[PDB]
């Protein structure tokens with residue numbers, strides 16, 4: 341398969357035509373996406389197959405071919421970029437200062453950017469280019485605008 | 497059945513488009529992995 345690092349689309353043929361159900365991140369030979377994108381199902385990459393290795397419905401994350409690799413975190417201070425991959429449109433960087441989700445379990449960065457559902461799994465970047473989390477699990481606010489958590493997993 | 501297609505390199509782009517605000521929101525996370533607005 342295409343094991344090369346970088347951002348990828350997640351496509352299905354099970355709906356009308358070719359539908360993009362979301363996005364993921366390939367890093368150190370491991371594919372990272374949100375759980376709700378695949379629901380833990382196997383993926384094709386050319387001839388190559390990708391089998392799920394790790395996931396958790398509550399963190400809404402899944403990894404393929406190996407353990408979660410992304411360990412960078414938001415410093416709580418600096419702007420970041422959503423590397424957004426909308427359906428049928430080119431990868432496009434958007435820069436923003438994250439807001440905050442305050443929870444009984446501590447605080448998480450949040451990005452207030454509206455995109456189609458099929459953008460779920462687009463990576464969020466720090467200034468050194470490191471992935472600090474995936475976009476597309478969050479909430480809808482007073483405006484009717486979307487706010488995503490910066491969702492990040494753990495590395496062993 | 498689902499498949500993957502490469503979309504780009506993961507890089508910071510100088511003079512990316514800058515937008516979005518920074519709300520501070522109280523949220524709950526349920527066992528299904530769904531956030532909801534606490535108020």
Ligand SMILES: CS(=O)(=O)c1ccc(N2CCNCC2)cc1NC(=O)c1cccc2ncccc12
Nearest residue numbers: 376400455456457458460476477486528529530
């Ligand atoms: C519709 S979806 O297939 O993307 C999806 C499926 C399922 C779920 N959740 C995740 C937690 N445990 C399972 C349930 C979330 C999502 N995403 C969204 O609904 C969404 C993604 C981007 C942007 C948005 N903007 C506004 C509202 C919504 C969104």
